[PDB]
């Protein structure tokens, strides 16, 4: 079945958990440092830190005051 | 050519 | 600047000016002219045009009557008086429309939305679809606002959706207003108030149908 | 302008006016003209249209008699006076319903109350059955009770059934409650009111669809 | 004064139109008299009326 | 067999339960609110309330006084 | 320099200026010109381009009428005044959306909310669907509430849906919070704001994509 | 010295000088000119060039209009006034770009680097790849700087790499700064701080994933 | 050939 992303926000002029301008959430970034290594053509590699996104973003209905 | 008009139908 | 729209009746005669030096055009919206007849040696050249259209050029200097017959058995007459000037376009229209086409809604709704709708309708009718079978109502399936008391009534479940009906009971003895969004519980797909009544008073016992997800993930 | 309708019986002879320089047309609302006969050397040229009418041109000056004949079996004579002017359009309305053996098969194939319903829905919406053709309305076809007046609008006839639409006006100052039965005249077979009306206020404008047996009585 | 809500409207669902015909006395094929009576039909069916306002 | 829709109405000048101008009854409208959801193309849908007709209309002979 | 856009309806007739020594071009934004007709002995040479336009050269000196006809079914007449000068380019914008039965199949094949989303993403990015063609924007197509002014920019139409872009300017000194619903006019079907905006400060420049039914109302 | 770049709109007219004695060239970046049209007997010779280019030589002594049509349905007009002198090159450019190509990253990373990355990601997600299976965490896999205390948590191993997660505990009660290089032990391939936080304070409990080499050699 | 045009159609 289709996903249902937002739990009802914290509970002119209608107080609806729905019908609120939706924003998207933030992706999660994780950094891995690679140990210096060598390769078949005998080159020594010092990469640094590689950052990758573990989770894609998801929709969110803002809490309404 | 009286009353004759130029009607070119293009393909 | 704009075609001269002329709605004359069937067999109608409309006197209109035409140009004796430049071609003139007559077209019927929604119809394709099939034939055009005029006194012999008045209209020198007649040509069919994309859709239903007749481009005619007349060198004559005398008023004459011209008959146009369309493809749906419509015949209209026109009295044409040639005059020096610009060619004139005429939009011939029927007087009283013969038939009324009922245009079907072309719009189609999303599959998931239909699935929720059908089930709710079936539960309301009481007919239970083939896949669905009866089971135990869930103990707490909805949020209870303002002192409401819920008693499990009935439920049926199937491969991808499940349904529960609960009877609401009002102990408040106050005038309450229903908003289906209040009865939301993390994991609900839809809430239906069987009686479409905005406000429940004390002992307002509306029954609400909620479809959640069987096999929830 | 609108075509002139004359309504001659199968024995009718009507003195109309024909044109000289530009062509003229006579058409049957419901039948296809198949032949047309005039004194030799009187009609210059004639053509049959797809709709079922006849386009003719008369270059002579003497008054002459023309016979037109249709496919269902019909013959109407018109006397034409050649005058200089524009072309003219005439609507030769039947006035005595024609014989249509193909229509009778469809009329009798189905049930009766159903047939009444169908013919009436059609009159209401405007989707006239394929076999039915426009005929002259009956001048006096229903009983007028106590102060109403009637005028005729349209009429459609097959083989065994007719159909008429009568505009009713209430002269009486006091509003008169009307019941379908009041209108029954020997030979009518159903009376239906378009706007269902228990009563008709003075100055009322109500049309009533009444059907009768074709040629009965 | 600010509010964030879609414009709510109430369904209309206009009714049907009924036309009744009165049937004059007739005798059928198998010879049974039918005294006057009536048949009723729905000229134009019912349908949802598109809203004129959304406030 | 054909349906028989009207029970005899509550029991010039003939008192007949039959032969009274018939009216048609009213359709029943039911509203369902759809929970906000997402779809494969990752669009978030906030439909609102959907109204459907559970029962078609039926004929009725008015009560006669 | 830029081409001149005139936007005549299917009945439109526009007095433009044509050149003599060097050739001229008239093209349809969304349709392929297939035929072009002028009085005999007026157009010296004509050629059809691959894009779908028409290159013509007029050597005569008298004012004349030209009809251009397209493939989707369209006809526009222009009145040309032969003047000595350089060639001229005219953008014959439709002004009444054309009929495109092939587009309707794609429009109706898919769901509805999806179709709205697609047509809107495209308007935002600029990747216009293959079937859609540029049509004259509606001068008054949305409700303007309490002090905004609008100007039109672009419009794309298929068979059953339209698409418009309207530049909104806030005359009022006080910033006005805007909700999509304010703009609804009978016949619109979605209103979306490009820059999602809770409020619009005075002197605002915000474009809003609104789509309507083609020919509805 | 440099081509005269000219970004004119579609159907645009640009007046430019050309040489009547030497060949001139017009080219469109990213487009190939398909056809070139000019008044008859003005441009003597026209030649296609590598890519999209037109080398034209005109002996005329009068201003004239020339139309160029490219291979993507673009048509541009140019008003040319011949003048004695050098041949002139013109870079014709579109006004507003029709589409935006999203260029994919062509860059590909080393295989070993990808292998380290995928595993770290999978461990973080908690999904464990098919080859990998759970085993015992290594007792001491990392250097402990500044009083940190490490408690084995989880590990999985596979044919060529193995992974261990340890929970760091800070007993220092000082503000420390993390550098992944500190946690190096002869034989480590990568260290990942699950929470990307530069400084840990007292009780800073970041969990670090270290992939060493199973089957170390 | 007055009023005539000249068009090369490059392949």
Helix-strand blueprint:
The structure is cut from a larger assembly and holds 3 copies of chain A, 2 copies of chain B (11 residues) and 4 copies of chain C (217 residues).
Chain A: E1 23-24, E2 28-34, E3 37-38, E4 44-45, E5 49-55, E6 59-60
Antiparallel strand pairs in A: 1-6, 2-5, 3-4
Chain B: E1 5-9
Chain C: E1 4-7, E2 13-19, E3 24-27, E4 33-37, E5 43-48, E6 53-58, E7 64-70, E8 75-83, E9 89-93, H1 111-125, E10 133-134, E11 149-157, E12 162-169, E13 176-177, E14 188-193, E15 199-200, E16 207-212
Parallel strand pairs in C: 1-9, 2-8, 3-9
Antiparallel strand pairs in C: 3-6, 4-7, 5-6, 7-8, 10-11, 11-12, 12-16, 13-15, 14-16
Keywords (chains A, F): Plasmid, Signal
Organism (chains A, F): Salmonella typhi
Protein name (chains A, F): TraV
Structural summary, described in words:
This is part of a larger assembly, with three copies of chain A, two copies of chain B (11 residues) and four copies of chain C (217 residues). Chain A has 65 residues and is mostly beta strands. Helices cover 0% and strands 34% of the residues of chain A. Chain A has strands at 23-24, 28-34, 37-38, 44-45, 49-55, 59-60. In chain A, the strands form three sheets. In chain A, strands 1-6 form a two-stranded antiparallel sheet. Chain A has a two-stranded antiparallel sheet with strand order 2-5. In chain A, a hairpin with a 5-residue loop joins strand 3 and strand 4. Chain B has no helices and one strand. Chain B has one strand at residues 5-9. The relative contact order of chain B is 0.27. Chain C contains one helix and 16 strands. Chain C has one helix at residues 111-125; strands at residues 4-7, 13-19, 24-27, 33-37, 43-48, 53-58, 64-70, 75-83, 89-93, 133-134, 149-157, 162-169, 176-177, 188-193, 199-200, 207-212. Chain C starts with a strand and ends in a 5-residue tail after the last strand. In chain C, a hairpin with a 4-residue loop joins strand 5 (43-48) and strand 6 (53-58). With 217 residues, chain C is mainly beta. Chain C has a five-stranded mixed beta sheet, with no helix packed on it. A five-stranded antiparallel beta sheet of chain C has the order 10-11-12-16-14, with helices on one face. Strand 14 of chain C pairs antiparallel with strand 2 of chain F. Chains A, F: This is TraV. Chains A, F: It comes from Salmonella typhi. Chains C, D, G, H: InterPro entries: TraK_C, TraK_Ftype, TraK_N. Chains C, D, G, H: Residues 104-212 form the TraK C-terminal domain. Chains C, D, G, H: This is TraK.
